[PDB]
């Protein structure tokens, strides 16, 4: 009670999660956008969409594998194009 009324709600001075982005008043877009980042960086949004229709476990595993493969080629492609750019720059 009193002993903790002083407790500045110690609790809520760092109590919640990352699902929050205090707004620096003034700029509002940025703040709202700051959430767009967290949201789009904890994949929260996309997961909701997935957790809508559950495919057979083998089917979802296959999909996951395919996604992984796609990811790995994209960064393999990126690596290749960076080398190509370097070669262009140098003279090769």
């Amino acid at each position: 009670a009193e002993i903790a009324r002083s407790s500045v709600e110690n609790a809520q001075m760092r109590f919640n999660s990352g699902k929050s982005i205090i707004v620096n008043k003034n700029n509002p877009a940025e703040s709202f956008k700051r959430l767009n980042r967290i949201m789009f960086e904890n994949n929260i949004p996309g997961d909701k969409r997935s957790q809508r229709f559950y495919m057979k476990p083998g089917k979802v595993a296959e999909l996951k594998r395919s996604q992984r493969h796609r990811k790995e080629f994209m960064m393999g492609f990126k690596r290749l194009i960076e080398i190509v750019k370097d070669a262009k720059r140098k003279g090769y």
């Binding site: 999660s17 990352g18 699902k19 967290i38 904890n42 929260i44």
Partner: protein, 91 residues
């Protein structure tokens, strides 16, 4: 007065070059921009919910080995320590 994204501020310690003093350079740098990573049984920290709090997307989520980039064993033991810490009251 000027914006940040346009003015390298090499510390004096370094070796500034004629190009180094250029925008190209600024762009270049951007492009090319951990006691656990050191080698301590990440599982031993099965409690200390402080240490584990680090490699965490701050959403009760561990990270793919694209960010954490910890050793397979280190990351898996860190993940196990986080999961074990969930069992160990704190975190």
């Amino acid at each position: 007065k000027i914006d940040q994204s346009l003015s390298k501020k090499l510390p004096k310690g370094t070796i500034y070059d004629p190009f180094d003093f250029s925008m190209g350079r600024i762009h270049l740098d951007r492009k090319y921009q951990d006691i656990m990573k050191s080698g301590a049984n990440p599982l031993e920290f099965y409690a200390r919910p402080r240490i584990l709090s680090r490699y965490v997307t701050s959403t009760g989520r561990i990270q793919h080995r694209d960010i954490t980039g910890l050793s397979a064993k280190n990351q898996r033991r860190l993940s196990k320590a986080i999961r074990r810490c969930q069992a160990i009251g704190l975190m």
